[PDB]
């Protein structure tokens, strides 16, 4: 005898496991047993993935009503998962949304400086660097203190709570409920910090005292800033970490991109398309009787739509495991999700992307792994896939 099948897989973000593809052929949606002990529905092919992100009928808020079955324990205030309809419901999506464009005058340059100083550093202290702790993650707290408008001195310990914000636990975490509220304390300090006039912090700080945004709670307001910056500097770091390896144990795409750095936008795209980056499938709760596939899900079932699954389904993207650069459908993956749902900072995150590689392609062409791939240590029970650390040398 077996127990039911188990999610996550694998937490490793360097080899997409070989019962994907086993599950997507002969059962794209198969039961599965989630690591608080709930069953869930594992969708894996890209029809049916796309099926359950396009129906709002599958809900994400609702994944947070008490006794629903759950994925892992809530990390946040149960109001919170419901955060970008609590943005639009405020009349607030469209500035949210405008502060955290990469066009902004001067986000590219500053981006740009940031990673050529990250990179002078690593070269000056001399070969092992890690591109994650002293190169990617820095790169994505910089780019956010300066969209949020914050000091760049106080992104340090704003990302120090991530490595627990962002865990996938079967229980709940102390320490989030310690970090979340002095986090919120923090953003409602910048909220009536004067100094605080530009990026999206200061105009939410604008918003928040204009007459027609006076029925907005000071609570939404922090809020903001606190999931924005959580949300974006774990994903564009968890990212460009992952798609760093990625490159790097493609030497001809390494050399083709250096070479040609035109083409790193298509690229980073179809880095996106095979990346790993997040560890557990995006979790929807069923708020009515619906046929997905061979299954019909129940009212209050929990789905669980596997990025990877629809990412690498041959019957969308022929030769899923190969980086084409001519692709008909090149952003039709689902690395930024789809619907109602889809990721507002995916231009800002792109870009994150585009930028940290034609850095790093110009100052370190010759960048390799200084470990065996193996030797990486993959983090987890956590909601991304990463490694801890990632020496590389050059
Ligand atoms: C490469 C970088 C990124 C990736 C791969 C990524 C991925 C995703 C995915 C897959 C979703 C959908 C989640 C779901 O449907 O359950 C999402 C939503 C979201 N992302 Fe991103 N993201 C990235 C960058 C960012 C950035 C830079 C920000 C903000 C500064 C951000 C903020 C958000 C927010 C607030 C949501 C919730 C949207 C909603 O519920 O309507 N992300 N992201
Ligand atoms: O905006 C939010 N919407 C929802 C759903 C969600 C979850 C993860 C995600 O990543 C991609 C995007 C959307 C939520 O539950 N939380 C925040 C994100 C967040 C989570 C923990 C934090 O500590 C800070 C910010």
């Keep these: ?46 029809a049916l993935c796309t ?99 914050i000091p760049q001195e106080d992104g340090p310990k704003l990302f120090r709570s991530l490595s627990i914000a962002f865990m996938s636990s079967a229980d709940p975490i102390p320490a989030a409920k310690i970090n979340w509220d002095r986090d ?17 912090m200061g105009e939410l700080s604008r918003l928040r005292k204009d007459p027609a945004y006076s029925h907005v709670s000071d609570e939404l307001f922090a809020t903001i800033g606190v999931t924005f910056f959580g949300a974006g500097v774990i994903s564009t770091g968890s990212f460009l970490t992952t798609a760093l390896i990625s490159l790097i144990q493609r030497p ?20 996106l398309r095979i990346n790993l980056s997040f560890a557990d499938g995006l979790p929807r709760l069923a708020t009515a009787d619906i046929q997905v596939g061979d299954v019909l899900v129940r009212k209050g079932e929990l789905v669980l739509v596997l990025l990877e699954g629809a990412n690498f389904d041959p019957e969308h993207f022929p030769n899923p495991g190969s980086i084409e650069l001519d692709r008909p459908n090149p952003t039709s993956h689902l690395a930024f999700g789809r619907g109602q749902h889809f990721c507002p900072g995916s231009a800002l995150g792109r870009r994150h ?17 200084a470990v065996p791939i193996d030797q990486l240590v993959w983090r987890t029970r956590f909601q991304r896939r990463i490694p801890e650390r990632l020496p590389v040398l050059w």
């Excluded at 202290?125 to 300066?146: I, M, V």
């Excluded at 919120?184 to 999206?200: H, V």
């Design 353 to 369: 992307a585009q930028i940290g590689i034609e850095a790093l392609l110009k100052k370190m062409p010759g960048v390799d792994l």
């Design 1 to 46: 005898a077996t127990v039911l099948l188990e999610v996550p897989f694998s937490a490793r973000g360097d080899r997409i496991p070989d019962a994907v593809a086993e599950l997507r052929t002969r059962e794209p949606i198969r039961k599965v047993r989630t690591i608080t002990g709930a069953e869930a529905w594992l969708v894996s092919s890209y």
């Design 51 to 149: 099926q359950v992100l396009e129906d709002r009928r599958f809900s994400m808020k609702e994944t947070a009503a008490a006794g629903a079955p759950r994925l892992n324990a809530l990390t946040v205030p149960p109001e919170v998962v419901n955060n970008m309809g609590n943005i639009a419901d405020a009349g607030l999506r469209k500035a949210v949304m405008k502060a955290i464009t990469p066009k902004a005058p001067g986000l590219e340059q500053f981006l740009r400086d940031t990673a050529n100083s990250l990179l002078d550093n690593l070269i000056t202290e001399g070969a092992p660097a890690d591109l994650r702790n002293d190169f990617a993650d820095p790169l994505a707290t910089a780019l956010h203190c300066k969209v949020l408008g």
């Design 184 to 200: 919120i304390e923090y953003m409602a300090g910048i909220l009536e910090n004067p100094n605080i006039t530009t990026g999206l």
């Design 252 to 271: 001809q795409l390494r050399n083709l991109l250096h070479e040609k750095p035109e083409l790193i936008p298509a690229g980073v795209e179809e880095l």
